[PDB]
Symmetry: D2
Subunit: 237 residues, 4 copies
Amino acid sequence: MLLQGKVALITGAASERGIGRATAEIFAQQGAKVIIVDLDLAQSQNAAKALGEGHMGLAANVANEEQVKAAVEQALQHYGKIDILINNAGITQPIKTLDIQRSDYDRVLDVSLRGTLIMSQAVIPSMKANGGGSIVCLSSVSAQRGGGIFGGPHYSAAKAGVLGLAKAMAREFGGDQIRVNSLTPGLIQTHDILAGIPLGRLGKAQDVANAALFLASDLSAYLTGVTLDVNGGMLIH
Amino acid sequence: MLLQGKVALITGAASERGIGRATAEIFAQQGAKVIIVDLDLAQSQNAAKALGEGHMGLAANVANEEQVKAAVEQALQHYGKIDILINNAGITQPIKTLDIQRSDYDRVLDVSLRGTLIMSQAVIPSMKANGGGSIVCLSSVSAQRGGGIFGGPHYSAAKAGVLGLAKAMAREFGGDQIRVNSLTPGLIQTDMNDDRRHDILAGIPLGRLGKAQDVANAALFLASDLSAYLTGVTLDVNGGMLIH
Amino acid sequence: MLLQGKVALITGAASERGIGRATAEIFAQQGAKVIIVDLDLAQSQNAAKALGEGHMGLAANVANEEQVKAAVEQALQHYGKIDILINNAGITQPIKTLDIQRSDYDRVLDVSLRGTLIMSQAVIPSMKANGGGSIVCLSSVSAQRGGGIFGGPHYSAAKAGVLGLAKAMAREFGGDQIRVNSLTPGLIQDILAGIPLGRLGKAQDVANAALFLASDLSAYLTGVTLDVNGGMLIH
Amino acid sequence: MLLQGKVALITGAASERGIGRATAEIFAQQGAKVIIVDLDLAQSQNAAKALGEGHMGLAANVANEEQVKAAVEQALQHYGKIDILINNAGITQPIKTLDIQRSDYDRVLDVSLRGTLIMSQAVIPSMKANGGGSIVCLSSVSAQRGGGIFGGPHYSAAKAGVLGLAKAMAREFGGDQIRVNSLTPGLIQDDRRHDILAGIPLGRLGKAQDVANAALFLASDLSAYLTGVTLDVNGGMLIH
Ligand SMILES: NC(=O)c1ccc[n+]([C@@H]2O[C@H](COP(=O)([O-])OP(=O)(O)OC[C@H]3O[C@@H](n4cnc5c(N)ncnc54)[C@H](O)[C@@H]3O)[C@@H](O)[C@H]2O)c1
Ligand SMILES: NC(=O)c1ccc[n+]([C@@H]2O[C@H](COP(=O)([O-])OP(=O)(O)OC[C@H]3O[C@@H](n4cnc5c(N)ncnc54)[C@H](O)[C@@H]3O)[C@@H](O)[C@H]2O)c1
Ligand SMILES: NC(=O)c1ccc[n+]([C@@H]2O[C@H](COP(=O)([O-])OP(=O)(O)OC[C@H]3O[C@@H](n4cnc5c(N)ncnc54)[C@H](O)[C@@H]3O)[C@@H](O)[C@H]2O)c1
Ligand SMILES: NC(=O)c1ccc[n+]([C@@H]2O[C@H](COP(=O)([O-])OP(=O)(O)OC[C@H]3O[C@@H](n4cnc5c(N)ncnc54)[C@H](O)[C@@H]3O)[C@@H](O)[C@H]2O)c1
């Protein structure tokens, strides 16, 4: 299978209907061993067991350096390597520009942007030592088109910041064969907007998961710094 | 078998070490029946038989409307449908702006741009009747960064026109479930002895040239159901040569 | 006087309501001498005369190498230099993918893409000898978002090809200080509802963007695609 | 006089040779009254007095909501309007991915991203009441190409976040005629510099005046139909 013998760590994959869980399932179907990292230990463990045999569920706030370090250490002690990192953890808030408070900014930016940085920092050393890896970051069409879907401007900023971080890490670690790419999903299921989608439907969690599979697998071995749109034509540019 | 039961037509796939042939091989390995369309009938037939059994090789100049329509008819009569179209046919020319003659412009634009339009026009009616399809167009990083690799400005222009055409067809036929996406390969190892290679390679973060199989795997993604929600996309395959 | 002492050649600027004429008018107001190149000699001469004094109107099909060479030579003979080239000439057709014929493809591609190449080829030698210049190419939002406004897919392809050509010429001639940039105008006078600024574009809006790219205010810009679409496409 | 009768607030314009000061000078030459907002009151007042007559210098940390509110209150009390906002304040740090600490992330993100949000939040209400305005945000080519110039990944991330924020505000306030656009400057004025210079088609580094002239375009009526735009000022360093 596409991820035969690979180990993948996916943040925010404990929710049954989320993109993270759909990615964990498709990754497990493709032969990978999956480490689910989310906020609730019991939920993460149960999600890992549902995948099958040989998976792991850990608890960590991706914005907490200490908790991330403990989770990555436990994963490396058991699997010895992390080939793939899916920075899927993220939150949104439908609050407009003038209503964004300091705590709203901090919460939204911490999960997506700071969390992608902290998790990447924790996994990159092992990837560099093991000869490379693949990091997938979750952005949003809102980062490209300027919101207008659900998340507020601080969400658009956070997901745009993820793109800048991912591109910068792609350039820094290209020589180490650590590929860093980003997904920009459109409106995913996890009327007026539907009319603006050429393919005439909303996205599925499995659609984003399949894009993550492509970027995590050797089918994309020559891709780094790429922003892969998964929006059904909602944004053609 | 990502392409099980699918039928794929690939233009310019008769060359031994080209992207088209690499795409045909990977597509066949994934369960697809492949129709190779190139300039030489014997070369196209031999390439198809090299893939395995049940494939087809046809001869047509993608810039010749009547030749394309004849080849597409022959493919539809045998297979009954075309699920995937890979507009891979293309030529390049390393001449600079002031040296581009009318015949140079015509030759380069005809294979890439007019050919992509003519082949897409010939296949789209059957795709609409069959409920959808996937069209992959071959562009180039030169269309995005303004050349500087090998092909001259008319090559950059032709491959940029392909992107405009692809996105326009993506929008027009989205309701018909005909996905149209483009590949923008970087410097790919095909048929590196000049000092200018060091500078180009130094600008590739992954530190190597691309391989035909790299572009073929991206075409496989766009041709398969793994990209069912992607249309109008431009997918860079350049090793980080252009991050934007 | 952002274009004081400058000489600018603008193709397709003979129509009274077009972007080309609006650009010529604003360029003349900013101190430039303008050479209008269009299909009809009398219409081009009258348009140039309407700008004021010291301007010139010439006739040439931008897709005709011989006619372009004659026009540029006449312009250089009189002005001695061409500081700015505005490749504004272009045509559109609202025909869909399956209805595009060979003649439709050729006509639309010839004016925008081949015309931009032929005119640029004819002016670049003098710009190299004169220490640089500014070339502005007219693309379209349709080249970026995939049509859906008016022009058909061959128009989107032609205007996308212009962007690729402009970027390639920008890279080749950067060392000659020949800046090459492109404009991607939106809907210029249902679509209105998808425009955040709540109005259609004006010919003067595109002309003002061309003025910026033609002037020294953009001395460090080359290979740029400048959107003038009122927010119709944010990306 | 492209900015005749306009009032422009420029953050981080107190440094002598910075982009902000160059923008203030060009804006003043074009008829605008400029409000310089920087960290030090004395430096800001002196910079404003150097522009000419009728200008104002204020002290505020763009990442401090109450200081920004006080400075904008004082500017609006004197001028009665703010037509233009240039979110130029920003800092950079040349540290690599694995060396970015929490304090580094906070410092860089606070000035560029949080500061742009806080200052825009403070000025937008008056722009809505005055019938429109123009907001120019300062990003960087590093946000587009993934660093490799000087600022580390957290700088690339902060300036990329500025682009996302600017586009989102452009879409939200288009109906209020508040245009929001971004500048992405390249390398603006030894081995690293020489190598970068070799990848610049125009063959030179940018000048503060080059970016100021682009800000003038976006602030003036010459760009009245532009919103949500990212305007590259990089001499061809990044063509895309
Ligand atoms: N429409 C969409 O669904 C859409 C569109 C664009 C981008 N995205 C991004 O895709 C990703 C998945 O989206 P979703 O719809 O699946 O979300 P979701 O809410 O279903 O799941 C996200 C998961 O992240 C976990 N999480 C939240 N904060 C965390 C933290 N600090 N540390 C660890 N885990 C944490 C939550 O517990 C949850 O399980 C997110 O990054 C989201 O922003 C989603
Ligand atoms: N470095 C690269 O290889 C690179 C980079 C960017 C884009 N591309 C594009 O990828 C595609 C494949 O590249 P390549 O390196 O494999 O090319 P290639 O030269 O090996 O093969 C191209 C094939 O197209 C065929 N062909 C030419 N004109 C034709 C016509 N009029 N009708 C039908 N067939 C025709 C040729 O016979 C040949 O078999 C082309 O579109 C090329 O421009 C390649
Ligand atoms: N909505 C828009 O108007 C819009 C949007 C995007 C791009 N554009 C482009 O902006 C430019 C101006 O658009 P417009 O609305 O002003 O068009 P327009 O029809 O008013 O003017 C075009 C001019 O080009 C001239 N012309 C046509 N073919 C020519 C040729 N072969 N040689 C010389 N001159 C020729 C015509 O005579 C006319 O005067 C064109 O390139 C157009 O595609 C326009
Ligand atoms: N190469 C470049 O110079 C370059 C490239 C891309 C983007 N930019 C951006 O352009 C802008 C100007 O760059 P520069 O080269 O002029 O910088 P600069 O250091 O000269 O000026 C920045 C100014 O911001 C002020 N400042 C810092 N933190 C502040 C705060 N919290 N509140 C208020 N003022 C504060 C400083 O006092 C200084 O006067 C910055 O946003 C920078 O990131 C610069």
